[PDB]
Amino acid sequence: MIIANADGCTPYEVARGVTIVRGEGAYVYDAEGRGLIDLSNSFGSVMLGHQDPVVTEAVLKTVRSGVPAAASLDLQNHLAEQIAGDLPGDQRVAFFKTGTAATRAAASAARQVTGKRLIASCGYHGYDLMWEFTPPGQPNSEDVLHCYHLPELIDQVLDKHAHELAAVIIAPDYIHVSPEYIADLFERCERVGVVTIADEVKHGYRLRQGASVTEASVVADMYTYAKGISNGWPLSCVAGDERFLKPLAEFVSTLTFEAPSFAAASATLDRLAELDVQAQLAIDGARFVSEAAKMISTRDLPIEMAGTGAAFQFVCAEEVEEVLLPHALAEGLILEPSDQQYPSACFRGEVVDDALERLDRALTTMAAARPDLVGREVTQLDRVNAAFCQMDGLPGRPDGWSLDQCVEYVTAQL
Amino acid sequence: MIIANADGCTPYEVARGVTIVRGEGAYVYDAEGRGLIDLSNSFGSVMLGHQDPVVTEAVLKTVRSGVPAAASLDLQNHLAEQIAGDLPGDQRVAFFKTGTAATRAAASAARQVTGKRLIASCGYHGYDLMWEFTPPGQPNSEDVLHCYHLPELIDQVLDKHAHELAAVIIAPDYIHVSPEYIADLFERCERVGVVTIADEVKHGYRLRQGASVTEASVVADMYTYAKGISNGWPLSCVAGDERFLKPLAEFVSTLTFEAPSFAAASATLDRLAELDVQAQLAIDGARFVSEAAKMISTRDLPIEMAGTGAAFQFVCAEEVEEVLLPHALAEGLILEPSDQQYPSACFRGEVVDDALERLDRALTTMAAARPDLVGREVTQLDRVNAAFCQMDGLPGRPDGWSLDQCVEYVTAQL
Ligand SMILES: CN[C@@H]1[C@@H](O)[C@@H](O[C@@H]2[C@@H](O)[C@H](O[C@H]3O[C@H]([C@@H](C)O)[C@@H](O)[C@H](O)[C@H]3N)[C@@H](N)C[C@H]2N)OC[C@]1(C)O
Ligand SMILES: CN[C@@H]1[C@@H](O)[C@@H](O[C@@H]2[C@@H](O)[C@H](O[C@H]3O[C@H]([C@@H](C)O)[C@@H](O)[C@H](O)[C@H]3N)[C@@H](N)C[C@H]2N)OC[C@]1(C)O
Ligand SMILES: Cc1ncc(COP(=O)(O)O)c(CN)c1O
Ligand SMILES: Cc1ncc(COP(=O)(O)O)c(CN)c1O
Ligand SMILES: [Cl-]
Ligand SMILES: [Cl-]
Ligand SMILES: [Cl-]
């Protein structure tokens, strides 16, 4: 086709054989009027639900005013205050339009302050070539080294380059590793004096009202947000200590301060607080995951639930996931492949029961269509592969694997 | 304040002492209800006028549908077809959210295809550190060399690095240099086989329905657009030959394909065609500039008009511009400093006469407030300084200047 970039982080791939035309709350609707429970939510950018009435009213009033970009100083500063006030310490906030822009800007700030170039990384930070994964110990074309969330690989990069690193940037994750495991990655870098960036683009405002790493007893020099803050409107930020944010003074685009996205984001943060969204998702998602695990068990299918609350995953072999996903779609349940699911604030009350009923039907048709899968075992390699897709790293060194085997595994995935 | 990035390319700086609350058509309105003719138009991102009724209806319908990101395949492909169809050749289109993202992506594509790193540049391509200006012959921190629109500096970089360059990226401009001058910059690079990027972020869809360089008898391997295509909504693109666009397949963000901006952009391109916008601006802007020059002449003030149509500039010393701009604001006319003005499609009919009447009053109060300025001469250095701010380069080597003097001048501006 003529659109060159319809690949990568594009959501709703399971539904490419149907046509989605409307979204409302927890549901999206196809061209035939069928409602589907949406667990993609634009890859987690929709934290409140589609067409949230308060976000929509704020955007509509802003559009109808016609106020041009960079004129709504009170609103822009207010959103910055909202974001900074949820982080421990004294932060300034620089706004961008995508998560990739925010993470590259955070890295650029660290390079400007330290005068160093090399960056070490765990996780996916966006589409820019600076974030392209290369094997352990091999700097990519923009001088970024990738450590795959392993403390031993962080230790190697620190042993060889601690004096040379502008920063370490870590995307936290908690489905397959603990908060203590994530905190240890940050602390190893802090102890040698390396600037830290907590890449909260995925989890910021999803797991709690602020940065996920705060609850892991971590503080970072800079934090990046995008998905959680704006309910599907294109806004992101770097929030961090003044020393690192001052070099971003001129990091501005013509439409950095277009008003509709600021209105959406400020309303989103207020609504997340008002509806107690992250705490309620912890409860409702836990119920979904526990009941899903029970249904899988009674049907003897080779799937395991991992995680809970706002971030959980159907762990299974690729061959099994390729059956699960179409069977769920046929029952009106949209799941993202090779990733966590992304429930929104609308995944509460009867919506959870509706989703469970649809999953129950999908598991029944799956077992009837593919009886050869009933009784199949989930292997260690299934679990490792599922973790590597979800968190873009290894969930610690798997039991029985040497560090060399970990490096060979990761290299083979690229 | 807590917003770290309120500097740089932020529009409406002349109005930082007043509060703008509404925009409609050619006008914005302050908190006291006063209407001001807007010649910033969000630094030229508003090509149709604030709250264009057709763009607004398309956006509102899209917001009210709640359709999530990446679901409106027909609309996304349609916009790509609209853009590619206005360029000679067979293009594919990769979408981004800001002009800076598009120009960095175009440069990255050239690096991927050629396997080379060094880039040569004329003009401003955005806020990323890769676009930070350094003196002639000094590569910046991301291996970009800056040539300041001078053919002799392009020749030096080609003499030293032609075999090494991934691409040359040129932002065209036509206020202070001719289309033939711009074409020569591209042709010098073509002849030695270097990939060319026409950075049309400012002029694409402003001067004609497509790339400005097309009318200068230029073709480029890639083109970047942003300001002209979306009437203030955050959307940009790289449009170019398949060989260069294929490496951008995975250059995607979660909200690359959020629907409101695509609806705005597709409606904007249709409206620009329907209202014959660029041709009509050529006429109305020419009338404004000619009459403005006449009024300046009768009042004997040290200002010269440069350019015409959709892109013109009040050329004067910084000391004079600092009087002109507040005096124009006091008469309800918003001008951008140290740049061209950016009239929109609403700058037609009686709006042009209204703007001329306001300018006439501002010139009268200026002459009465600052009688010492009456009869002052505009110097060569005034003209060169004005060109350097507007086009981020030299308008050819000024008369009587050596190439060394040009290099020293540019170095002193950084
Ligand atoms: C197979 N090589 C992959 C490479 O393709 C790429 O994978 C990304 C992956 O990281 C992204 O996925 C990542 O980002 C998404 C978010 C963007 O929606 C998160 O939801 C998800 O948890 C995270 N794994 C996915 N969206 C696209 C793949 N091409 O980056 C990591 C990698 C291992 O190098
Ligand atoms: C004084 N050093 C400057 C440096 O500050 C910067 O200048 C930019 C300038 O290029 C931009 O201006 C540029 O981009 C704007 C567009 C973005 O609105 C265009 O309208 C304008 O014609 C163009 N000159 C201006 N918006 C911000 C300055 N800091 O980039 C060029 C430079 C010469 O290195
Ligand atoms: C953790 C993380 N960091 C950064 C990014 C990049 O953000 P974006 O897709 O908005 O460019 C992503 C991908 N969305 C992400 O999940
Ligand atoms: C010619 C040119 N190129 C690229 C850019 C960068 O675009 P943006 O401000 O949208 O990031 C600009 C500045 N807007 C520009 O004028
Ligand atoms: Cl709902
Ligand atoms: Cl009007
Ligand atoms: Cl961006």
Residue numbers in the entry:
A (entry chain A), B (entry chain A): 1 to 414
Quote the study on this structure:
GenB2 acts as an isomerase, converting C2a into C2 by changing the stereochemistry of the chiral center C-6′. Four genes encoding PLP-dependent enzymes (GenB1–GenB4) identified in the gentamicin BGC and a methyltransferase, GenL, from outside the BGC, are responsible for the last steps of gentamicin C complex biosynthesis. The structure of GenB2 shows, as expected, a characteristic PLP-dependent enzyme class I fold. Similar to other enzymes from this family, the active site of GenB2 is located in a deep cavity formed by a groove in the interface between the two protomers of the dimer, and each subunit contributes with essential residues for the substrate and cofactor binding.
In order to gather insights into the binding mode of GenB2 substrate gentamicin C2a, we have obtained the structure of GenB2 in complex with gentamicin G418 and gentamicin X2. G418 is produced from gentamicin X2 in earlier steps of gentamicin biosynthesis through methylation at C-6′ by GenK. G418 binds to a groove in GenB2, which is negatively charged and agrees with the complementary charge of a positively charged substrate. Also, several aromatic residues have face-to-face interactions with the sugar rings of the substrate. Thus, Tyr124 interacts with ring I, while Phe133 interacts with ring III. The ring I interacts via hydrogen bonds with Cys9 and Asp392. As expected, ring II, which is most deeply buried in the GenB2 structure, engages in a large number of direct and indirect interactions. It is possible to observe direct interactions with Lys227, Tyr342, Asp339, Lys202, Cys389, Gln390, and Asp392 and indirect interactions mediated by water molecules with Ser338, Gln340, Gln390, and Lys202. Interestingly, Cys9 in the complex of holo GenB2 with G418 adopts a double conformation in our structure in order to interact with the substrate. Our ligand-bound crystal structures show that the thiol of Cys9 in conformation 1 can hydrogen bond to the C-6′ amino group of gentamicin C2a and could, in its deprotonated form, be the base that deprotonates this initially protonated amine, allowing it to nucleophilically attack the internal aldimine.
